Every structure is written in structure tokens, then in C-alpha cells.
Amino acid sequence: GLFGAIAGFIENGWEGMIDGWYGFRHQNSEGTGQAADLKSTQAAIDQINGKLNRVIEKTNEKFHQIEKEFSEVEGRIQDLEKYVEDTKIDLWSYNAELLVALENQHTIDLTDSEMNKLFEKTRRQLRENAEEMGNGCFKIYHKCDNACIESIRNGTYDHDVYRDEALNNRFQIKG
């Protein structure tokens, strides 16, 4: 949608991630793994529920109204009784049709946004120690075991701890 993460630079979803809406997959020298990110999952979920509750907010009640079905032909007054109702129904149907179109459009950009925000957040944390492979994956240029992967995920990763190892691996090489 507007941010180009979902169905964008992230090629496709993971049918296998059953524990959250957004998450991480990694491959290091100790193995491969997957893990949902619960904060961005909750952020997306809460906004969609907020939106949902606003839409289901109070059915108003109406009691005696006007007749809407007639068995005899009467002319002028019954023509008006029918026209008031038919123009009321088209106006409420327009409203319903526009409301879900705007809402759905926004739900797709909102979830695209949370994906991109989690990507950016992880980018900012890895600092000079990783490079973006451009497909939603970072190449971490230093040895990062499963506790290192866990610290990026739970947001406690210290880039300084691995900066020189990373900068060496990343740049120096032979050019």
C-alpha cells in the first residue's frame, strides 16, 4: 500500500507464522529460526479493533415511523411517502459503501505502515553493523548467536559491542 513493505519490498507473507502478524526469521552459525514480534502485532490489532468498535457503536432505535408498503393506489401523498423512503435508503447505502471502501483502504495502509515501522526500527538498532539486502532482510556482518538474535528482537542489542568486528568484515575486505 502506501509504504511498499507488504506486497512490496517484502516479497510475500509467511503462511507458517502462526504466533503473530509480524516477525523475524534468521540464519546464523548456530541455526535458523522464526519468532513473531508481539509489539507490532498488538499495534496493528488494536487499531483495527478501535476502528471496528467505532463502526459497531450504537444502533439508534426508531419506533412509530411512516408506512412503507401500501395496498391501494392513492396518488400524491403515497408518492411522497415512497419517495422519502427511497431517497433515505439510497443515502444510507451510499454511506455504507463509502465507509467500508475508505476503511479497508486505510486498514491496508495501516498494516503496511506497521510492517515498515518494524523494519525501520530494526534498521536503526543495527546501526553500522548490518546492511539491507533490500528484500526485508539484513545481513549482520559479525558473529551473532541466538542470544544476539534475541537481543535485536527484544530490542536490547548493543551495536557498540560488535562495531569494530562488523566494520572490519563489512568494509576492509580488499577494496
Partner: protein, 328 residues
């Protein structure tokens, strides 16, 4: 600083989102079918088929319309002094008493339907000089002839029908509804046989209003043995006002007043069965749940109901776009 010791390697971390095998199509500002992870339906499109008898007070009219219950057709005597939040009228209802017509039937049915009560108070009208309680074989009450329970057909006594001039003050603090009528005979002979005068006249008035109706002699189609008709009228009398009924023939007199109230009552035409269940929204197709915001069951509703919409499905996306690994 941190000392590597020996190892020199890299790791890969990839961010991603879920996807589901199934997925639902939804409309958008720019697409009209785009597939998302999950959606929720906003249009209620099915009734239970039964009018739940709770929380509103449903009154099933059985084979009485509300006007016949009001007038007091013998077969609707079950409804006297009855009350309702919703009066349900059935397609099978039939009238079976003196043939009548109501000039503005639709406003009288409305006006009683939202008052919500058929509470009737009998008042001591004194009709001097005429024969009270006339009844007809087209309105059988029991083995005998009869008439509407709430109306009083006056005819001559002996050889005269006087000019009736009666009054009934509204001394209470509420509005009073008076239902009265006029008899249209089939023949001039019938007119004089019953009312002596060859031209009747009924004038009912208050300080605020007056109706004078004069009868119309002529043959109408045979209905339950009769070609005559009575036409029904109504007068509301406000607190402090006074009713004066003045006639010289053909008056079908009131027996007292219905009392009027202000409430949430209405009337509905439906053949749906009433059943025991609680449901706030009533539709002539039966109750429907008001959990969704819009409904497509019927434009006629009573109670806390979803807004009727022409569409029968409107799905609200409750998840991200579905971009599966394989296909859909």
C-alpha cells in the same frame, strides 16, 4: 574493547508478516476485490423467522385489525382495554359486524397505534327521546344481533327523533379520544323508518373544532346482508375543553372515551410467529440481531435495529493484505 578471539562470520535476519491460505476479498478506494487476511460482515441479511416476545410488549391481533379491536367488533372483544408496544396485524384478519368505512383510516390506525392503549372509560351520556342500543344481525353478538361494543346506535322512540344536544366536559388532565359515526341508509324509506327526519345531520364540536357530516342515502354492495354503511369519525378533546354532540338523525353515538398516551408504540403487519426469546429489533420477517451496523432484511423495523441498506454484503477488512507463499 570486546575481543573476538577467533570467529569471523555473518548472520541473516529477515523481517516478514503472516499470510493465510484462505483470505477474503474486500473492496477498497482503488480496487474492488483485493484479498486480505480476514474481514467481518457488516450487513445482517437473515431473520430468525420469529418475532421474539421480549423486551417489547407484542400484542398479536390474531384475526382482528387494530381498528376493529378499537370499535369493538364482537369477535375482537378479547382486546378491550388492551395495551402494546407493537400491535402485530395479520393478513388473515377479517371484519364481521355492521359494514363501515373510515374516511381517514390511515390516520386513525396511526393515531391509535402509537397511543398504545385501548383503555376505554364509559361516560354517562343521556340520550333523551331516542331508542338506544340498536343492534344488527350483521354483527352477531352471541346468538343475538349486536353492534360494536364501543358505539351506540340511536333510533327513534315511537314517532320522533328529537334534536339531540348533549355535552361532555373534559375535566381530567389528559386528552380524550371519542370515536363516533354516522349511518348512511340505503333507501329514503329506511331513513324515515329509523330516524323519522328525511335528512339526518351530525355535528360534533369542541371550542376548537367542529365536524358536521350529513348522511348519504343510496344502495351500496351487499355486505353481510346490508347495503347501508356507517362511516367512522374521531374527535380528540383536550383537558379543559368540552364535547358537544348535536344531531337530528343518523348519529352512531360514542359510549365514552379511549384515553390517549404518548409512548414508543406502533403497529406492524406481519404473519411471522411470535416466539419466546429476547430480541431488540423487529422486522415483519421476524426478529434480527442488531450486532451488525447495517441490515438488508426489511426496510420496516421497530426497535434498536441496524440501518437498512440496499447491499446484502459489505465486508470490513480486519487484517492486512494476504500475500501467500504459494497461491489462493
Amino acid at each position: 574493547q570486546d575481543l573476538p578471539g577467533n570467529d569471523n562470520s555473518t548472520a541473516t535476519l529477515c523481517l516478514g508478516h503472516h499470510a493465510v491460505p484462505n483470505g477474503t476479498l474486500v473492496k477498497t478506494i482503488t480496487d474492488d476485490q483485493i484479498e486480505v487476511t480476514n474481514a467481518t460482515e457488516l450487513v445482517q441479511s437473515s431473520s430468525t423467522g420469529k418475532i421474539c416476545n421480549n423486551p417489547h410488549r407484542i400484542l398479536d391481533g390474531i384475526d382482528c385489525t387494530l381498528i376493529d379491536a378499537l370499535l369493538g367488533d364482537p369477535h375482537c372483544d378479547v382486546f378491550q382495554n388492551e395495551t402494546w408496544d407493537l400491535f402485530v396485524e395479520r393478513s388473515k384478519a377479517f371484519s364481521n359486524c355492521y359494514p363501515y368505512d373510515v374516511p381517514d383510516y390511515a390516520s386513525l390506525r396511526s393515531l391509535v397505534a402509537s397511543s398504545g392503549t385501548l383503555e376505554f372509560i364509559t361516560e354517562g351520556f343521556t340520550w333523551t327521546g331516542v331508542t338506544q342500543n340498536g343492534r344488527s344481525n350483521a354483527c352477531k353478538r352471541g346468538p343475538g344481533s349486536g353492534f360494536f361494543s364501543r358505539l351506540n346506535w340511536l333510533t327513534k322512540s315511537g314517532s320522533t327523533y328529537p334534536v339531540l344536544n348533549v355535552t361532555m366536559p373534559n375535566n381530567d388532565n389528559f386528552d380524550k379520544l371519542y370515536i363516533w359515526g354516522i349511518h348512511h341508509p340505503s333507501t329514503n324509506q329506511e331513513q324515515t323508518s329509523l330516524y323519522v327526519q328525511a335528512s339526518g345531520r351530525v355535528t360534533v364540536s369542541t371550542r376548537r373544532s367542529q365536524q358536521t357530516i350529513i348522511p348519504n342515502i343510496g344502495s351500496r354492495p351487499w355486505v353481510r346482508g346490508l347495503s347501508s354503511r356507517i362511516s367512522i369519525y374521531w374527535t380528540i378533546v383536550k383537558p379543559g375543553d368540552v364535547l358537544v354532540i348535536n344531531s337530528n338523525g343518523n348519529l352512531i353515538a360514542p359510549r365514552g372515551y379511549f384515553k390517549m398516551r404518548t409512548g414508543k408504540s406502533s403497529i406492524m403487519r406481519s404473519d411471522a410467529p411470535i416466539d419466546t426469546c429476547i430480541s431488540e429489533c423487529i422486522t415483519p420477517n421476524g426478529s434480527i440481531p442488531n450486532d451488525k451496523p447495517f441490515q438488508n432484511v426489511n426496510k420496516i423495523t421497530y426497535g434498536a435495529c441496524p440501518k437498512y441498506v440496499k447491499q446484502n454484503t459489505l465486508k470490513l477488512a480486519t487484517g492486512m493484505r494476504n500475500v501467500p507463499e504459494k497461491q489462493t
